[PDB]
């Protein structure tokens, strides 16, 4: 039917990555971050910047031949937060409303089997 890439979306709390590869992931087709759409550091991870990022990502994809994508959402993971950033849901919604068709959706947040020590110290970050 359609020709699938894989939209590997990394939505942290400081930025939002929209990166579409082939199925293998060794070939990158389009990579637009929320920081290429705004000039303020404070909203690099905003839903607005992620939606704009997906439209440019979506815009670049049609001219290469990608008509549909699979979604691999991840949060920062590791020792840091496992919840996705605010930009991951809007960039995903933008892709569906941009004419790209969506296949499988998966969370690929890296999750440790206990892991190494987390930054911040014993008492946490005191504010």
Partner RNA sequence: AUUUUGUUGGUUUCUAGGACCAUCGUAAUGAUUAAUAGGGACGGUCGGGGGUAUCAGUAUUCAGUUGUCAGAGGUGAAAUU
Positions in the binding site for RNA (CB under 7 A): 12-15, 26-28, 30-31, 33-36, 40-42, 44, 76-80, 110-116, 127
- Smallest gap, in angstroms, from Cβ of residue 67 to RNA? 19
Residue 14 CA: distances (Å) to CA of 10, 69, 107, 112, 125: 11, 25, 19, 21, 17
Q: Report the distance separating Cα 29 and Cα 122, nearest Å.
A: 43
15 marked as part of a ligand binding site: yes
Is 43 annotated for ligand binding? no
Does 107 appear as a known binding residue? Answer: no
Nearer to RNA, 83 or 115 (CB): 115
């Amino acid at each position: 039917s359609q020709v699938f890439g894989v939209a590997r979306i990394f939505a942290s709390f400081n930025d939002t990555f929209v990166h579409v590869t082939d199925l293998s992931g060794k070939e990158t087709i389009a990579r637009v971050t929320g920081g290429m759409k705004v000039k303020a550091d404070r909203d690099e991870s905003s839903p607005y910047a992620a939606m704009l990022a997906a439209q440019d990502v979506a815009a670049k994809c049609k001219e290469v031949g990608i008509t549909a994508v699979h979604i691999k959402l991840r949060a920062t993971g590791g020792t840091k937060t496992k919840t996705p950033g605010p930009g991951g849901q809007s960039a995903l919604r933008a892709l569906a409303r941009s004419g790209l068709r969506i296949g499988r959706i998966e969370d690929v947040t890296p999750v440790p089997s206990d892991s190494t020590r987390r930054k911040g110290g014993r008492r946490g970050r005191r504010l």
